[PDB]
Design a protein around this ligand. Structure first.
Ligand SMILES: *[C@@H]1O[C@@](F)(CO)[C@@H](O)[C@H](O)[C@H]1O
Ligand code: NI
Length: 949
């Protein structure tokens, strides 16, 4: 008879091995009754919270159940029922019903009324393939879910391909300078999925891209099959023309396939011919590039010009419908812009839209499948589930919400202190000043000592920064030179990765030095790493830590196989299994380290990589070594929005870009010599102006990068429109500080998110689903950056709402329409939602320079609204013990009534008495933003007051 007839499971208390399922305390384990090759044997539903379900599956006859690196213990047990009804077993909490079929192990989730939220691939969507690495065993796993046509997806980290809304899209999840992977997605169907894997993963297509010669017939410039043509025009000498098998020069091994006797700096390279596919459909291409690049396909400019500095290539994707058997022209124009540079083009063959639309996860190596489902009333509630599972985000120190000035790099104590004093002298507000790498003696990276010729008294430097009411952040790497005592202490305990040592790698500094990176997955290595920081930097009074190369970036531009060799083995297993969580491990070392020394003092860490759970360590990510390019600026909008949707609410970017086009450096040198502006230097000024405008509305407002200097007075002089604009926005950040710091309080108290795609607040208006170039800054402000040189307007979609108001003029704009909006050089388009209650304070030079005694409470009428003004001591964790104050405010449109609520809580130094001026903006009253606006004066002492406007 059937396999089922011969072998199937089915007394209240007999051994579980006789039964189809077993309920324990918080889970049900189901034995799959129709086992398939590569399918699950066991599927477990574990209840983590009313809205939180942990799904595990394995091909083995027991679960490995390793300790998660990301999910923390939960606060309380959760009550639930289980019902078995034939093939269906359903676990129900008060808020969700999670069902599994015994036959296949397939899972689905509904709300309390049985409305479907998420369904696994019909018949099952899980596949297991064994993998063995370095004597450790595990599985490569795929998990696929059904997805309706109107579902939209956000998250996955911070990627640099300008993708927004991942429905039907692909992304590879690994870490590399500018690319931060977080295995979490949020849907507009109000749930999230967190995949608990630390290996290389993929969302969408589970396959690697293919070289062009594997999927197309190629014809060269002369029409000869078997290749494309590569034409290399050097800066000096003879042009070389050859046939190319494939366009794939993407790492140190494959760039050796470029022509041997042809210098690439200043070269112009053209790859061209025709391609012919063998099937019909949408081909998905990926371009890997450094230097300047353009791509044309079928006579269409599919990739308008992009650039990265030669050493930090990026990926950009495009797709095209192609017909089987038809030749189409292809042309790539490439200016390598360095002696070593990168260019590659690969593709995926068409996937049926029915399959390509599904939600597909692939994981190279884990011990079992583990994922977490979190349902929500809205996307904020989904994020709250993620915060419950992976830890709440502490309130950043208030000073971190001000302006940060950085440089690659301040070279001396005098230079750094001079920059700070420049802000104070010019009355341009600033909280934070940053000391980058190379502050140590040249031969002593990892010693954590200062070069005393350039920094003669580091303690006096920090004391001077504090005397000017600023905070100091310092660069710290997980990299140590082999000659240092600190390296030797890791090494003698087996806590240094050896591949870089074995291979005699030299870095770029001076003659080149030998180095390694430490194993942050070892708990004792983490404690040593912190102890070294504690012995050398902490006593100087340094406030904040800036960790570079936390991917880890052991060697630039290497292939996957060599990157894995460079960063393992780890204390937990192979680097194949433990590939993506290095930054998280380092964040644990620093946060737990510093709170171990002083539990009261706030922690600030900024790191280049990231992972799920990062936020629990009061750690932000920055988007890394991006280019001084309009297209990179644009990409930062979508990258930041996806990062926010990945659950991590503090994020930043190098305003202006990190790596600088040569023409901009030459523009600056000309300015220094002659005080004349060339065409490139004009562009430099406009790029920085627009990028500062954007940056003023991201969670951390920070300028950094390579030469030119990035202080505003270096970019343009007083009176120049760039100076006037950037100083306007810098000041505005500080006038907004009562609002901004309330958002920071909300990150902890309400599991909030600061930089928000429109889909979060306007989920019901599906026109917002693909908009990745506008965003909300908190609940009230819609920001629409200008990201093209010369533009003095841009198209803006106003989500469906009672209305919107131009911030600058107060003029009304209807919801639910798209229009071209003016955007002068000096202004970023900025609108306020009807119903907004926004507190503004007076000019200050730094956070808390003065108490916020007089706040202007702007009420943008036309809809109901609520806002809570949050305050605390700013610098310590006393809010964790209830030392904070909230002033809730509520506005009712129907009665035009504002309630300023009774104050809840108190703390040391809190204003007991204060003043509000309540200022209205409405459809009949276009009130420009103005601190001196006419309104109603309220003297507030903590007691509720009600105003009828
Ligand atoms: C790591 O490298 C530096 F230290 C030097 O380029 C920093 O300035 C960069 O911002 C960071 O990516
Ligand atoms: Ni030491």
């Amino acid at each position: 008879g059937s396999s089922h007839h011969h072998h199937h499971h089915s007394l209240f208390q007999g051994p579980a091995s006789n039964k189809v399922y077993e309920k324990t305390g918080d889970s049900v384990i189901v034995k799959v009754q129709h086992k398939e090759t590569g399918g699950p044997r066991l599927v477990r539903l574990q209840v983590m919270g009313d809205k939180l379900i942990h799904v595990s599956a394995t091909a083995d006859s027991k679960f490995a159940d390793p300790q998660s690196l990301i999910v923390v213990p939960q606060k309380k047990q959760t009550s639930f029922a289980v019902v078995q009804n034939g093939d269906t077993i359903t676990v129900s909490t008060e808020e969700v019903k999670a069902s599994v079929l015994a036959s296949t192990g397939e899972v689905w989730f509904t709300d309390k009324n049985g409305e479907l939220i998420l369904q696994e691939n019909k018949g099952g969507g899980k596949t297991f393939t064994p993998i063995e690495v370095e004597g450790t065993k595990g599985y490569t796993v795929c998990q696929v879910f059904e997805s309706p046509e109107d579902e939209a997806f956000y998250g996955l980290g911070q990627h640099q391909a300008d993708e927004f809304n991942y429905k039907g899209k692909n992304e590879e999840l690994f870490q590399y300078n500018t690319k931060v992977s977080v295995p979490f997605v949020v849907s507009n169907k109000n749930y999230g999925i967190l995949l608990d894997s630390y290996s290389f993963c993929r969302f969408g297509n589970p396959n690697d891209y293919s070289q062009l010669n594997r999927i197309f017939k190629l014809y060269d410039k002369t029409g000869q099959e078997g290749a494309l043509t590569g034409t290399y025009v050097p800066k000096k000498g003879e042009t070389l023309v050859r046939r190319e098998d494939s366009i794939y020069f993407e790492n140190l091994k494959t760039i050796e396939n470029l022509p041997k006797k042809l210098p690439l700096m200043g070269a112009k390279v053209t790859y061209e011919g025709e391609i012919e596919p063998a099937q019909t459909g949408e081909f998905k291409f990926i371009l890997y590039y450094a230097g300047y690049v353009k791509v044309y396909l079928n006579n269409e400019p599919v990739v308008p010009e992009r650039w990265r500095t030669a050493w930090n290539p990026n990926s950009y994707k495009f797709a095209a419908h192609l017909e089987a058997g038809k030749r189409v022209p292809l042309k790539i124009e490439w200016q390598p812009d360095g002696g070593q540079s990168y260019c590659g083009l690969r593709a995926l063959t068409p996937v049926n839209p029915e399959e390509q639309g599904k939600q597909s996860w692939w994981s190279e190596m884990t011990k079992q499948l583990d994922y977490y489902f979190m349902a929500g009333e809205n996307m904020d509630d989904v994020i709250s589930g993620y915060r419950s599972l992976t830890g709440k985000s502490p309130v950043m120190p208030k000073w971190a919400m001000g302006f940060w000035q950085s440089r690659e790099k301040y070279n001396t104590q005098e230079e750094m202190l001079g920059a700070l004093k420049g802000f104070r002298d010019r009355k341009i507000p600033l909280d934070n000043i940053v000391l980058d790498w190379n502050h140590w003696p040249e031969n002593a990276w990892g010693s954590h000592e200062f070069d005393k010729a350039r920094f003669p008294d580091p303690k006096a430097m920090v004391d001077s920064i504090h005397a000017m009411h600023a905070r100091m952040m310092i660069s710290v790497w997980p990299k140590f030179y082999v000659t240092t005592e600190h390296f030797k202490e890791f090494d003698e305990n087996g806590w240094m990765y050896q591949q870089s040592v074995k291979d005699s790698l030299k870095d770029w500094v001076g003659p080149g030095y030998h180095y390694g990176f430490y194993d942050a997955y070892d708990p004792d290595a983490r404690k040593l790493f912190w102890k070294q920081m504690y012995e050398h930097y902490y006593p100087l009074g340094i406030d904040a830590w800036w960790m570079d190369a936390s991917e880890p970036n052991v060697r630039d531009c290497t292939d996957l196989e060599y990157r894995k060799a460079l960063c393992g083995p780890t204390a937990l297993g192979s680097s194949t299994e433990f590939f993506n969580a290095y930054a998280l491990m380092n964040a644990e070392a620093i946060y737990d380290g510093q709170r171990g020394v002083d539990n009261n003092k706030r922690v600030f860490l900024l790191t280049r990589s990231g992972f799920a759970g990062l936020q629990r360590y009061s750690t932000a990510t920055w988007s890394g070594d991006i280019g001084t390019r309009w297209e990179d600026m644009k990409a930062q909008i979508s990258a930041g929005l996806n990062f926010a949707m990945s659950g991590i609410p503090y994020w930043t970017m190098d305003i202006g870009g990190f790596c600088v086009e040569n023409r901009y450096v030459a523009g600056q040198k000309q300015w220094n010599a002659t005080k004349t502006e060339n065409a490139d230097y004009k562009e430099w000024r406009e790029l920085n102006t627009r990028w500062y405008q954007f940056g003023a509305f991201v969670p951390l407002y920070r300028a950094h990068g390579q030469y030119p200097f990035r202080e505003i007075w270096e970019i343009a002089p007083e009176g120049h429109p760039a100076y006037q604009s950037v100083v306007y926005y810098t000041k505005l950040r500080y006038n907004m500080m009562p609002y901004i710091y309330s958002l920071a309080g909300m990150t902890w108290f309400d599991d909030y998110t600061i930089m928000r795609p429109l889909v979060m607040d306007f989920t019901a208006d599906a026109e917002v689903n693909d908009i990745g170039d506008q965003f909300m800054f908190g609940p009230s402000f819609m920001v629409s950056p200008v990201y093209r040189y010369g533009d003095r307007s841009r198209e803006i979609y106003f989500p469906q709402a009672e209305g919107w108001y131009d911030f600058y003029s107060g003029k009304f704009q209807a919801g639910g329409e798209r229009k071209v909006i003016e955007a002068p050089y000096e202004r970023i388009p900025l609108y306020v939602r009807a119903g907004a209650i926004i507190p503004f304070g007076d000019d200050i030079q730094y956070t808390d320079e003065k108490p916020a005694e007089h706040i202007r409470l702007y009420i943008y009428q036309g809809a109901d609204g609520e806002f809570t003004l949050y305050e605390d001591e700013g610098v310590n964790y006393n809010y964790e013990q209830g030392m904070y104050a909230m002033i809730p405010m509520k506005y009712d449109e129907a009665t035009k009534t504002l309630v300023i609520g009774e104050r809840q809580g108190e703390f040391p130094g809190m204003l007991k008495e204060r003043t509000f001026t309540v200022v209205t903006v409405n459809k009949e009253k276009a009130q420009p933003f103005d601190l001196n606006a006419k309104g109603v004066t309220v003297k507030y002492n903590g007691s509720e007051q009600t105003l009828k406007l």
